[model samples]
Target: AELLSQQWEAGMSLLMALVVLLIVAGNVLVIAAIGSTQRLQTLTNLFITSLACADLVVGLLVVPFGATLVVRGTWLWGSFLCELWTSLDVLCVTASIETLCVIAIDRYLAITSPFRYQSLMTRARAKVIICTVWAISALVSFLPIMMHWWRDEDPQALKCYQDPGCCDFVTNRAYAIASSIISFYIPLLIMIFVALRVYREAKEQSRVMLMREHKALKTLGIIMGVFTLCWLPFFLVNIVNVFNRDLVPDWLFVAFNWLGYANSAMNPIIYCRSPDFRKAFKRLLA
Candidate 1:
């Protein structure tokens, strides 16, 4: 549907290629900065590393495929691949969003309830939580597609509305709401609530601790803000299409949906991370 101009498709091809390169490079650097650096190997950074890894999957899987769909203006990848792509897109991106929630909760507990956080969120426990997040993400993304829940009774229409414009949704409204609420909305609410509480507590600390407190809150705040900002529009469109299918025009779907998928691209480079990773990255280069 006029996905690109023949007049400009040549230029758009190069631009989309660069977009993929940057996303993959940025997330890989974050992963490398964490993986290879001793000083950066804290429990908190572990979660960030996992989060970056999930973003890497998105860069590896979703963005390029989506860009291809845009350039080609058709799902030339076939049904099974289309299905698989949508599922992988869900698994990776939802894991990303859930991991962000984990970071917010971890940071909030660290700031507001330090002693409990220390005992509760150890490396082992953190690993467990991270594993749980991936498991939940897999179930969320795969189960519906496997079970064909998105189909309309016969529901033989192409399923999985997750990949922005891969195919369209004729059914599956409940699945969209349920998945979004659990994966994105609920976690978002919790992150925002916990972030504000952490801010309030940081205000009450002593002079020396105040700087540390501000730093912690600022880091976590940026993480949460970037996540919310990047993903909110995509889900908003999902909900809109659910309630009134006609409300979302195809072009808007293509635009906002890509914007949503582009969140994975934005996070690694634009992520609000601690200086330890920076130090670690520099050390690696040296």
Candidate 2:
């Protein structure tokens, strides 16, 4: 099959590079803002910091190789690098998704049981939660890859379908469904549920608390909305590909995958909408 035309490849490479830059720069500012600003060092911001770190990993480690594959139409690096890249991609993306879920739950706890939340999600507890998020992500991403559960049984099936010269992970049906459920679908449900509950509870609160929480809830709503909008289609298509191999076109899969990737860029932008973070960002940049 003919690869993407030269112009198309060039345009896509450039576009992806721009996104990578945005993702890197925006997350750096977020991390730096949270790290440096005492006011921004709340328990909630700790989760945001971890989430930003995951996005930074995507920008630094994953996207460059992905952009190279887009531009060159093949994986020039050998199998080991290909495996490493895909594994790291899974690890980081899963960490990001789970972190979002945790953040939503944290918000829900804080709003519904304000006093209990302080005790329940203390700094030490939050650190453990964050650590477990990454640990679970590693379990899903690296364990499956290392055990070869993510790969097909056929020896040669690891080659990219569009270009046999290029190597890629060929996940089995079980791994695809299992990983999608663990990393995306379950967390998606939690986020949605948390958002609705928090909204209703916020409506019930007193004027001062309601007004204060209203802004935070808006930020939470956007975060969930962006995450669902960006990643839902990709996981849906991923499952469809497992059930009916080529029913979804390769281009559609590629597009949705990048749409999911673009969420990292959108996150810090969303963070800037929050008043405290907005102030911190201005303080850091200016």
Candidate 3:
């Protein structure tokens, strides 16, 4: 039994490491492509950069710490640091998702109301909005840790997806749901609404619009679609696990965890799928 457990841990650790590496490499390439290309310096590209920055932090800070906890099945990093880890995890995830919301809104405005988009979402206004998003996320994510909502539990030491790292899920159920709603579902709804509006406006405005506009809209839709798919399962599992207790299977938990982690890489692929973005990336890479 001991040997089997050891083997299982080893295999899972390697798999997790591979996933993290792929995600990191993909996001880095995305950042490089965007940073090197002058044409990619639009409002949307700025949001992409923000997303990449959040993902980079996940790849660097969250994944390894999470993997270690999964393998060791305890808070080996000490209680104080464990709390810090949880806080940081929440902050990063919240920031990434909320930034996506901002991006969606920006796209909506640009497509549906091009006349006022520049005035409304100017560089200065964008900077302020970005700062606000990060500030809100940080505040919400740190609240539980500050309020002592999570207590140390030895029995529920198994990390991976079962435990919420150092935090107690049972105790922090409300916080989890509230944070998830604010950071994900609400923003998701806003994105969908704006996307639909944009498409309608585009169809009405010009039957002979530029390919660039179509490509941009398609790319943004793909991004939001991927984000929805990747995060929905995790949030569903979290909700179910909160109420039912022991409802989520270990394998499902692991799968959802990886799905959520992989979302960081999907945006780059979506960007590359657009011909304009692909050409720009090639030029930048060259």
* Candidate closest to the true structure, highest TM-score: 2
The best candidate in terms of lDDT: 2
For candidate 2, give the lDDT: 0.84
lDDT of 2 by residue, 1-286 (tens): 2444877887888898898999999999999998998887999889989999999998998988888887887888876788789898888878987898888888888877889987777789989999999999998888778777776665556445345447656777888999999877887787788778878887776777667767877887887788889989999999998889769898889889888788889888887767788887888888
Off by over 4 Å in 3: 1-10, 150-170, 206-209, 279-286
Clashes of each: 2, 0, 0
Instruction: Looking at model 3, report the run of 10 residues with the lowest lDDT sum.
Output: 160-169
Q: Which regions of candidate 1 deviate over 4 angstroms?
A: 1-5, 153-166, 169-171, 206-209, 271-274, 283-286
* Candidate 1 lDDT (Cα, 0 to 1): 0.74
TM-score of each: 0.86, 0.91, 0.84
Candidate 3, 83-160: lDDT as tens digits: 677777777778877887787778767766788986777767777888898889888778767776543343443442
By summed lDDT, the worst window of 10 consecutive residues in model 2 runs over 156-165
Candidate 1 local lDDT, residue 201 = 73
Q: Itemize residue pairs with steric clashes in candidate 3.
A: none
